[PDB]
Write a protein that binds this ligand. Structure first.
Ligand SMILES: [Zn+2]
Ligand SMILES: [Zn+2]
Lengths: 96, 98, 101, 665, 138, 110
DNA sequence: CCCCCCCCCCACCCCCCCCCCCCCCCCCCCCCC
DNA sequence: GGGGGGGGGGGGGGGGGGGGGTTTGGGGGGGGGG
């Protein structure tokens, strides 16, 4: 259902000591040795959520690599409440 | 026929309390005895010699308020209350009656 | 820092940071009701290169060869990563308090 | 629906690509149909944002950066074209796109106001739209040292060349739009942080009032950059020769530019009245006095070391405080007990015009660079020496008409213009005998006084406190000038009877009302009152009769409430307050009206070690006043112990005892 | 007719405590300690007749240093200050606040009595500490 | 309409000490004059260092403390030594104005 | 003198808190004396 | 022309709801036995 482009042959290279604030959100090409590799876990990719108040479903959030999804308020009832993962409309990707 | 429901009370400096014995009669009893003013002292100290008595009396009368806020409350009740007017005019009427 | 309000997409900007990660208290839009619900705009916000380094009292100066005293030092910007472990350095800067955030 | 907004933004984005761009073969290069695209963008402003009251196009145009990335490049390159052509003499077409760029700049820099009549969309969009105007102002002043400013004057010069009659309505309008451009570029200023009050405040207030966009610093927006770019584009020369040439369609915008140059700058900053390090050393010594003061008010040992003082009162009861310094100084103990109270009296609260001397904090100053200081002071000097009386006659002879229709903003800016330049010339002429009071003679011409009187009277009758404050300032400078010319001397006696009766009463009523209004309002009331009293004394209808109208308790409340800001006031302001007290208490001898505790408190606080400067001349006046005041208070209390109660209260308006209270027989 | 500054819980007048300490901080002679303690046979005028804590305060002012070290037994030698030793041992925070303020006050008193050119601003800036010691049995 | 209140920056208090420190530092930075083992063609070292920063597009300036110490009775150096944390924003304001005056290209990453 | 051992070091209720709602007080404006 | 009463805003209190609060292996240093 998807294709990912892999950006080969990016010309500029940095060592891990060499990265800085000015590289933040930039594409980078880095050299190193893999020192510790974790397991092949599933991770959420596209996830509709359920508000436990009101008409539950919320539209699909896209999960990043960095933080949990936050739902400040339920967009249906425009208020706070408890939230839970929707078990039908959620899809997983590999993570490591 | 009905069980009570609570409601928060509030207290404020009523003219009656201002005219209690510890009110202005306290000032008349004690101010001329306690304030002393002299050329022997600087202006700041003489002003303090006034302010100390009025502050202690204000706190002993109505400890809730700050001294300046108390003074504003006193000036405004002075601007308004009729019994307080009758008392104040009675003071200067007594001085006239001397 | 720069933030956008969760219930209206207005943007607050140039939020000066204390020792805590600091978020706006009021929304700039008078049509909006919000206090304290925000998303950080990474691309608009400003960061500094930062590096803590710890120093200890110089070997010849410890009064009788005892345990040295220690201090935390903060480097920022172009001064980061110039120092090294085991190096003997002179610093200049500000002595500061840091709260338990 | 927001679908309309994204469609609109897509349209304006496409137009943004139609204007032009850099040509790599870098120079900016216009697009095909570029004139029609500029006209269509002008039409978008009209068609949507004006006709529907939206400002959506004014937001979208900033999103796609058309002003900074196309229009100023077009104007600056066109300026270089025309400059080089002038030295070496299809411009007939490129002139048109330069003009339409100027029209678009005037639109996008057009001043923003928010009122009850504004649409919900407009007041929602107001803040970020102001921020974008600030980026525009930065770019206009900075880019190529602001060469677009010379583009604007060149566009004006190309209709100033032709005859007075030959300037058609279109040419008259074009010159007016150039003036509106310069006015707007002066006038852009950071917006007010405007907060919804339905929801309560958190446990902390607003985190910051700073409303600048991230790519702007306040110095980019400051007057200094305006002076520099206007000098380096000779905008000052353009304005000076323009006002010299006046011999009136454009007169109101031309006044308005000088208002916007003057509204927030203080005249004394243009006069001195190792130097920087020397003055810094002086400043640091002054605040070191406050350091030794707080050090006296500070414990010699750690905070957990605190023992307990007990104040046993004159009665057989005891209080408790932890202050180690207070333990050996009962003054600190008493006042600290009072500081500890959780209770406070709750205090009750208290727009289409810009910030100014009307509403700024009273110590605010523009810190000029000395080059900009010289350029600005010499520019306004040459203006006074040429353009003042002619301009003031032209616009005041307008404002004789249409007073009923004069918009509030227009009224206040006219009054501030009058006051500012009159005050400046008086000060310069105090400093230089070479400068002449007659160079602002138009101020004293009787139509001017009559109009200023009509403005203040109508504003006060209408209860327009903003314009009332402006007219109060203008009256102060009129009276100030009158005193100077009475010394320098006919018209003085004319105004000194024209201001009789109801005008005396009106002037007497502002300091009655002033206690209900802001510090600057009260300050202008005090300034006006000091000027009025020195004027009447200089003349001296009856002197006792007039001053009796001032010596009444709400005026004393206004003077007190002004004086309550004593640390924030300046030495001369305190001097004026205490000269007024000198009159009331020593000269007029209505001493009973000042025997009230608020004054006693305020006198102690300012005479305190943490009060005034020990070396202040105003402290010397306060000390002199306080010595006499305490002596008379002691004497009156000795004669009348009822005043120990009366000191707490307003005096008795019941005359039958009030006379006895006032004088004691 | 006036308020009184009292060490809380004690009925000690702070003003009287202050005078009782001041009159020892000046006019105390170290001979009085040799009258109090042993070695009374070794009184020597050229070391014991000095106004000992004024000697301290003047050297302290020349060095510009904040601390006055005070052997507690010296309070019991001077007649007006014997009670103040017990007040110190039982209420030390308040008595030490009094002693600190009195040292600062006496520094001012010495420069204004001598009307000296030494900076009043320095003395006013400076915090002053008493460091009492040799209180009693360890 | 939405009930609301306007908060205005123009009624802020500005530290006249900090503003005067900024002025003194700004003057120092733009004209502190010295040269050695040469004729008196003074380098005006920190203006030249702003030009060096502009050439190399740096984002820091190096200041010798003793150069401030000799300047204008040393009051500026004493102040910046004692109470640096108050006066650093004022110093950056002064620096920003000087860089605008002699090297406006540096005010952005450019 | 050299090698092996062994020792060290390290990886459900109750309180605080915050939000919401209701009442009371204080000021301003208008009318009455 | 001043004081009372009516009406509206603003602040403070009180209640209600919610969330938080030791074994095993490995390397290196240090000491003891062949
Ligand atoms: Zn919901
Ligand atoms: Zn919002």
């Amino acid at each position: 259902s998807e294709i990912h482009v892999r950006i080969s042959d990016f010309p500029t290279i940095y060592s891990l000591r060499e990265l800085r604030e000015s590289n933040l959100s930039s594409l980078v090409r880095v050299t190193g040795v893999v020192t510790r590799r974790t397991g092949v876990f599933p991770q959420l990719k596209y996830v509709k959520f359920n508000c436990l108040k009101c008409g539950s479903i919320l539209g699909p959030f896209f999960q990043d690599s960095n933080e949990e999804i936050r739902i400040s308020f339920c967009t249906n009832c425009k208020s706070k409440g408890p939230f839970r993962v929707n078990g039908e409309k959620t899809v997983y990707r590999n993570y490591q | 026929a009905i069980t009570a429901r609570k409601r928060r009370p509030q207290v404020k400096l009523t003219a009656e309390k201002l005219l209690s014995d510890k009110g202005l009669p306290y000032v008349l009893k004690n101010a001329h005895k306690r304030i002393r003013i002299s050329s022997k002292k600087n202006s700041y100290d003489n002003l303090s010699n006034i302010i100390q008595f009025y502050q202690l009396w204000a706190h002993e009368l109505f400890p809730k308020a700050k001294f300046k806020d108390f003074m504003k409350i006193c000036q405004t009740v002075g601007k308004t209350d009729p019994v307080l007017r009758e008392y104040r005019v009675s003071l200067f009427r007594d001085e006239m009656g001397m | 820092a720069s933030f956008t309000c969760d219930m209206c997409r207005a943007i607050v900007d140039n939020v000066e940071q204390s020792f805590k990660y600091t978020e706006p208290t009021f929304c700039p839009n008078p049509s909006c009701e919000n206090r304290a619900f925000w998303t950080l705009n990474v691309t608009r916000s400003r960061f500094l290169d930062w590096q803590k380094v710890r120093i200890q009292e110089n070997a010849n100066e410890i009064p009788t060869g005892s345990m040295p005293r220690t201090l935390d030092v903060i480097l920022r910007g172009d001064s980061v990563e110039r120092a090294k472990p085991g190096d003997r350095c002179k610093f200049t800067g500000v002595e500061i308090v840091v709260p338990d955030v | 629906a927001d679908f309309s907004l994204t469609v609109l933004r897509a349209r304006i984005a496409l137009l943004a690509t139609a204007i032009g761009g850099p040509d790599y073969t870098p120079p900016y290069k216009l697009g095909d149909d570029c004139l029609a695209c500029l006209k269509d963008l002008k039409r978008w402003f009209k068609l949507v944002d004006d006709q529907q009251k939206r400002w959506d196009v004014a937001m979208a145009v900033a999103e796609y950066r058309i002003l900074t990335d196309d229009l100023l490049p077009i104007l600056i390159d066109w300026e270089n074209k025309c400059s080089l052509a002038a030295k070496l003499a299809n411009k007939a077409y490129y002139d048109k796109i330069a003009l339409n760029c100027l029209q678009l700049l005037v639109l996008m820099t057009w001043p923003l106001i928010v009122t009850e009549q504004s649409s919900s969309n407009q007041i929602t969009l107001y803040g970020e739209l102001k921020k974008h105007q600030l980026v525009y102002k930065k770019t206009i002043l900075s880019m190529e040292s602001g060469k677009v400013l010379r583009a604007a004057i060149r566009l004006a010069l190309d209709v100033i060349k032709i005859d007075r009659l030959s300037r058609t309505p279109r040419d008259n309008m074009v010159l007016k739009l150039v003036l509106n451009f310069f006015r707007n570029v002066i006038a852009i200023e950071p917006g007010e942080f405007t907060i919804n009050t339905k929801k309560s405040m958190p446990k902390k207030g607003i985190t910051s009032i700073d409303t600048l966009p991230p790519n702007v610093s306040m110095d980019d927006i400051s007057l200094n950059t305006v002076i520099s770019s206007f000098h380096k584009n000779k905008v000052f020369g353009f304005l000076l020769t323009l006002t010299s040439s006046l011999s009136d369609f454009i007169n109101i915008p031309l006044l308005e530019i000088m208002f916007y140059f003057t509204k927030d700058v203080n005249q004394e900053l243009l006069f001195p009245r190792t130097s920087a390090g020397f003055e810094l050393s002086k400043l640091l010594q002054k605040e070191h006095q406050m350091r030794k003061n707080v050090i006296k008010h500070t414990s010699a040992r750690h905070s957990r070391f605190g023992g307990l003082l007990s104040i046993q009162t004159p009665d057989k009861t005891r209080l408790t405080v932890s202050g180690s310094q207070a333990l050996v100084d009962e003054k600190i103990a008493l006042q600290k007990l009072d500081d500890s109270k959780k209770w406070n009296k709750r205090i009750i609260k208290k727009e289409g015009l810009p910030n100014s001397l009307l509403n700024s904090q009273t110590g605010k100053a523009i810190f000029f660079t000395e080059s900009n200081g010289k350029h600005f002071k010499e520019f306004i000097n040459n203006f006074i020496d040429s353009g003042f009386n002619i301009l003031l006659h032209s616009v005041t002879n307008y404002f004789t008409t249409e007073q009923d229709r004069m918009v509030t903003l227009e009224q206040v800016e006219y009054l501030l213009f009058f006051a500012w330049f009159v005050k400046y010339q008086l000060l310069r002429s105090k400093i230089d005998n070479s400068a002449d009071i007659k160079q602002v003679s138009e101020a004293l011409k009787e139509v001017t006084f009559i109009l200023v009187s009509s403005l203040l009277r109508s504003a006060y009758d209408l209860k327009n406190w903003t314009v009332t404050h402006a007219g109060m300032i203008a009256f102060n400078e009129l009276l100030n000038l009158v005193s100077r010319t009475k010394a320098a001397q006919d018209i003085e006696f004319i105004v000194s009877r024209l201001f009789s009766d109801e005008r005396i009463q009106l002037l007497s009523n502002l300091p009655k009302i002033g206690s209900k209004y802001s510090l600057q309002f009260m300050k202008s009331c005090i300034e006006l009152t000091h000027s009025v009293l020195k004027v009447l004394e200089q003349y001296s209808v009856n002197f006792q009769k007039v001053q009796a109208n001032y010596m009444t308790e709400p005026v004393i409340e206004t003077y007190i409430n002004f004086l309550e800001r004593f640390r924030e006031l300046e030495d001369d302001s305190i001097k004026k307050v205490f000269s007024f007290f000198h009159r009331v208490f020593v000269q007029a001898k209505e001493q009973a009206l000042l025997f009230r505790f608020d004054l006693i408190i305020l006198l102690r606080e300012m005479l305190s070690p943490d009060g005034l400067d020990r070396m202040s001349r105003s402290r010397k006046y306060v000390s002199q006043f306080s010595d006499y005041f305490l002596a008379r208070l002691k004497k009156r209390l000795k004669k009348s112990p009822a005043w120990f109660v009366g000191l707490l209260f307003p005096p008795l308006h019941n005359s039958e005892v009030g006379f006895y209270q006032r004088y004691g027989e | 007719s006036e308020p009184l500054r009292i060490i809380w819980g004690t009925n000690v007048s702070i003003q009287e405590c202050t005078t009782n300490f001041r009159n020892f901080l000046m006019s105390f002679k170290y001979k009085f300690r040799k009258i109090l303690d042993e070695r009374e046979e070794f009184i020597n005028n050229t070391t014991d007749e000095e106004l000992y804590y004024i000697k301290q305060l003047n050297e302290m002012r020349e060095l510009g240093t904040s601390n006055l070290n005070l052997d507690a037994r010296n309070l019991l030698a001077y007649k007006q200050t014997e009670d103040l030793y017990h007040q110190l041992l039982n209420y030390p925070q308040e008595v030490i606040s009094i002693m600190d303020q009195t040292i600062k006050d006496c520094m001012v008193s010495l420069i204004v009595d001598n009307n000296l050119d030494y900076d009043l601003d320095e003395i006013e800036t400076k915090f002053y500490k008493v460091r009492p010691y040799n209180v009693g049995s360890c | 309409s939405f009930k609301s209140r306007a908060l205005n920056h123009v009624k802020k208090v500005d530290d006249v000490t900090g503003e005067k420190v900024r002025e003194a530092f700004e003057q120092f930075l733009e004209d502190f004059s010295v040269q050695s083992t040469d004729t008196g063609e003074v380098e005006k070292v920190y203006r030249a260092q702003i030009e060096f920063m502009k050439i190399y597009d740096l984002n820091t300036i190096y200041i010798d403390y003793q150069h401030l110490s000799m300047r204008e009775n040393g009051a500026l150096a004493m102040a910046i030594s004692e109470q640096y944390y108050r006066f650093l924003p004022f110093l950056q304001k002064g620096l920003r104005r000087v860089v605008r005056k002699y090297a406006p290209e540096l005010l952005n990453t450019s």
